[PDB]
Amino acid sequence: STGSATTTPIDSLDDAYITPVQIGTPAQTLNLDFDTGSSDLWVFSSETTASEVDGQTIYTPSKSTTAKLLSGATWSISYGDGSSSSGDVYTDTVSVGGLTVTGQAVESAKKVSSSFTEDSTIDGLLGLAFSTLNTVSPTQQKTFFDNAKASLDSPVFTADLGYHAPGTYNFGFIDTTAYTGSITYTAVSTKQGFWEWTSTGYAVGSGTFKSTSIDGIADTGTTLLYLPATVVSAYWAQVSGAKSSSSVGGYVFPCSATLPSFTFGVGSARIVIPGDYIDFGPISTGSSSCFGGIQSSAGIGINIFGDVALKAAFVVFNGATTPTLGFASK
Ligand code: NA
């Protein structure tokens, strides 16, 4: 089997992407944030505290003929941005892009933090990291990908995120029409439960490539590119008037600037992030200070190849017995 679903930016900045997901019988379609940096499929629901719901579509298990309480199971998760959610668990039928899993753990939120409530466009998350990170207790649950894997034509999914445009998540096949040149594959460590890999270096604009190992994770659920402070300083030094602002919480730059590209290495291959991808617009409405899309990972404890980086590539998440990542230009 295969599946193919379109993923759509939630706003004009590509702050996140949503993908429609069918849950239950008859189907309830919720727009989920596919997150290769976490391993829980959780939803706004009929159980979510009413004051914490503001415009999201909810899953109502009592209206699904295939929903079953997973008795005694609870979940609770905290993300890198400080947001959180928790609740109980149902099993139900979940379909993505025509690919169906029966018996998927659907984590029903009883509580969500303010950042979730305030984002009316995201109805929950669908985690695509390794199932070792799943938070369900006392019986840890599998991701949608891990449950689908054995049925797929190939044990893979691909992320093809758009810049200010829709893109695609495919399951079970490589679309050889969706990228240019060849796919370069690189090793993955699953020791921390992430799609963790090592970039071979970077360049700023038309500058020379610096060969250096940068360990980090491929994380579709993170907006920005978070890299070591040395790398980030080297980037922003090429933008007149850019500075790190402790008041704003990262590098800012004059909205009048033209940003340089940023290149990262994948083995001997190179992915180029156009400068435009690094502009996250005014820090507050009408400001002439703009927020940068490349930020320091110092204090976060890991480097994160988030959407700024991933949307410059066609990315293969190879879930074979020995997982690997692939990157192609597009
Ligand atoms: Na922000």
Look up the CATH number of the domain holding residue 150: 2.40.70.10
- Look up residue 172 and give its DSSP letter: S
Q: Where do we find the tokens 């579509």? A: 57
Q: Are residues 50 and 128 in the same domain?
A: yes
Cβ–Cβ < 8 Å for 119, 223: no
Q: Which of 159, 174, 189 is where one domain is finished? A: 174
Beta bridge partners of 263: 203, 272
Beta bridge partners of 126: 34, 41
Alpha carbon distance 111, 312 (integer Å): 35
Q: Ligand 1 centroid to 158 CA: how many Å?
A: 27
Q: Are residues 191 and 249 in the same domain?
A: yes
Alpha carbon distance 167, 161 (integer Å): 5
Beta strand 225-227 pairing with 250-254: unpaired
Alpha carbon distance 190, 326 (integer Å): 15
Cβ–Cβ < 8 Å for 182, 321: no
Of residues 241, 21, 269, 13, the one with CA closest to residue 122: 21
What is the helix, strand, coil percentage profile of the chain, to 5? 10, 45, 45
What experimental approach yielded this model?
X-ray
Alpha carbon distance 330, 18 (integer Å): 21
- Look up residue 209 and give its DSSP letter: P
Q: Give Cα 258 distance to the centre of its chain.
A: 27
Q: Ligand 1 centroid to 74 CA: how many Å?
A: 31
Q: Are residues 192 and 294 in the same domain?
A: yes
Q: Are residues 167 and 255 in the same domain?
A: no
Q: Are residues 96 and 200 in the same domain?
A: no
Q: Give Cα 179 distance to the centre of its chain.
A: 20
Q: Ligand 1 centroid to 269 CA: how many Å?
A: 31
What's the token pair of residue 222?
């993170």
Q: Ligand 1 centroid to 93 CA: how many Å?
A: 35
Q: Are residues 281 and 329 in the same domain?
A: yes
Q: Ligand 1 centroid to 229 CA: how many Å?
A: 18
b vs e for 83-119, b when ≥16 Cβ sit within 10 Å of the residue's Cβ? bebbbbbbbbbbbbbebebeebbbbbbbebbeebbeb
Distance in angstroms between the alpha carbons of the first and the last residue of the chain: 25
Q: Are residues 268 and 236 in the same domain?
A: yes
Provide the resolution (angstroms).
Answer: 1.0
Alpha carbon distance 40, 109 (integer Å): 11
Q: Which helix (H) or strand (E) holds 71?
A: strand 68-78
The SS3 of residue 303 is: strand
Provide Rg for the chain, Cα atoms.
20
Alpha carbon distance 316, 330 (integer Å): 13
Q: Ligand 1 centroid to 166 CA: how many Å?
A: 21
Q: Which helix (H) or strand (E) holds 120?
A: none
Cβ–Cβ < 8 Å for 167, 311: yes
Alpha carbon distance 284, 308 (integer Å): 20
Q: Ligand 1 centroid to 223 CA: how many Å?
A: 9
Q: Which active-site residues does the annotation give?
A: 35, 199
Q: Ligand 1 centroid to 290 CA: how many Å?
A: 10
Q: Ligand 1 centroid to 201 CA: how many Å?
A: 26
Q: Which helix (H) or strand (E) holds 90?
A: strand 84-96
CB neighbour list of residue 247: distance below 8 Å, 6 or more residues apart: none
Q: Are residues 181 and 167 in the same domain?
A: no
Q: Are residues 124 and 258 in the same domain?
A: no
Looking at the structure of the chain, the number of domains it has is: 2
